Amino acid sequence: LGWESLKKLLVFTASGVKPQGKVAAFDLDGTLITTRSGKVFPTSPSDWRILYPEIPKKLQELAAEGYKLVIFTNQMGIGRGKLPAEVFKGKVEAVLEKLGVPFQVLVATHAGLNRKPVSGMWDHLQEQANEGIPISVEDSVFVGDAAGRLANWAPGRKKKDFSCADRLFALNVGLPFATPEEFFLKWPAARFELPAFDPRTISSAGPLYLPESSSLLSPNPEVVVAVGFPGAGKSTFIQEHLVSAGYVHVNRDTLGSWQRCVSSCQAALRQGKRVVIDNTNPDVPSRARYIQCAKDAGVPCRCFNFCATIEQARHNNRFREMTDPSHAPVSDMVMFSYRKQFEPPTLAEGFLEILEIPFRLQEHLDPALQRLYRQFSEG
């Protein structure tokens, strides 16, 4: 073995690499090497130096201890065509020569499962790149600069970390984690923050809606107005519980305008059918339209308030981007536009009742896709 080109993945295996039950794993940029010129993006393929003088000696001590030395690096520039693959391989080989110790390098080249903090590269390490030898995760380490540290975590470091990917990667595997200065220079633990939403512990347990005493659907004609972030999981919930149960689906992304939504709502009510307005519906003016249609027809109007937070819907968008090749990308501009327009649905508007729909893990998901769901999608 030497270099390997695989499915959205590059793997280098040097001379002297022996499989072990322990792994000392490392990020590349910001952890083992850094830029000579002080800039974030390297100016050339020779704009690199070994980060700390203490590094090579530590790596020898780890290798003699019986740790398999492994690199996990994200390099999106390879897949995009920016950074040529051969240029990076040449850089890598020069670095490992300067480190003076056998390494195995795993390079994520495309978005998706292999990209940190998603743990696809660790999966490949265990399932393919270790000679069947099981790795004790508790007896291992991952070291990386993207650790989500707060502002002023050390003197000199006034600004917070750009990313939390390295720390979350370790949390997705279960690896003990250290920052470059903690691990190599024996600095005290720096203060950090994690995402407000932890997907690792999300379950499908709990009530489908609240209050539990309420009736989910009506045996009689009505209008249901759905309120939630884009990516709150509305459409999937709507299709399963309402539309396939006989409700007329009114969707703005299919109809093209709100006037057409109002039109469809009125038309369906004249046919004595129950309707769902499957829109974001962030503000009172938006919902007022569909409340008015219910009045005109003399049917009750109910609200389905999806409780997904911005971080939960964004995570759900990231999962769909990762699993579904036909998924239209929900931008930050749209996500934060919803939050700016958002007014909490009240009974004062004209609703008979409002139901809360909690954000839950999808029950219908495959075991392998649940495994993927319960991981941090972005640093």
Next chain:
Amino acid sequence: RKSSLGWESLKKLLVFTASGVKPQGKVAAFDLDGTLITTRSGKVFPTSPSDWRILYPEIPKKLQELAAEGYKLVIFTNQMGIGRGKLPAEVFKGKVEAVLEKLGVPFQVLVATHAGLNRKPVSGMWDHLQEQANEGIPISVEDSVFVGDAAGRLANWAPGRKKKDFSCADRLFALNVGLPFATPEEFFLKWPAARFELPAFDPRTISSAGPLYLPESSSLLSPNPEVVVAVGFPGAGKSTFIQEHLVSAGYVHVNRDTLGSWQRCVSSCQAALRQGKRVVIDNTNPDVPSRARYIQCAKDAGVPCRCFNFCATIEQARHNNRFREMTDPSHAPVSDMVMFSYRKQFEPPTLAEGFLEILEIPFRLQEHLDPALQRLYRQFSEG
């Protein structure tokens, strides 16, 4: 037919299946013209069988990514030129194979040759894929996707494209089937969803609900002799409504298409009133002078005259014709010339013309339709 090695010529349908095509539980389906390929020349019509180029460089990679993910790759293309005799069948067959060679991916190609069920927006070609072209394997609709450029997009949706979408066919095809839709720009390039519009008439709004006639306090039959003047577009369902509610209860039918001339229509009206009967004038009667001749027949026989004003709009009646064209073998096709001529001539019926009362007949769903035919009726049948 099911499972073929290559090309097969079915009823108003051509199907190609390349080698290496597997049946799948999901489908990435595409349009051909303006979606996967465009003209090399830049004009609307191709100048040669080689006057084509792949629309966007990103396309081939995306097709491979979808194939690897277990999506069956299908092309739904409208080629009326083959049916109309304008384009030879062998030239297009040779063109498709060349395109599929350049794309470097196993495709199944479905070609609508004539008008009718297979002519998208109508879902005939998709239903054939489910029932005949996928080898027993059911396709999850919501797990699939259709991509096309006939998407009813408004003017100036991108830089340098002043003209709006010529058609809305591709989007409505997916809307009929229930498929997730994307434009090539949205699908391949990840460009923001472009603003669009659906046709003013949505077939799904038509049902058996609501009143049969307005006002409801009236009665459409009369015990004493009268003349009923029908007013409505060709394809409004005048004839059907009248035959069910009036003729079957003893009203004399007067119809221009059957009788041959307007003077023959006036004679038959006069003769019916001479026999002391009540008569319906089942003609289009778009204008005041044309329907005045029958109001005069009523006055001369000393009987009242009523108007049945059929509410079908032009789009509603054109939908109705296209539906009859797909379902009734003995249906005479109404041209768009006659449809436009009625609209130009049309004058709203008023009481000042000499009517006793005017009834409005809402465009309701045709009575006694089998479930399968109702589902065909709810489909958009024109892009």
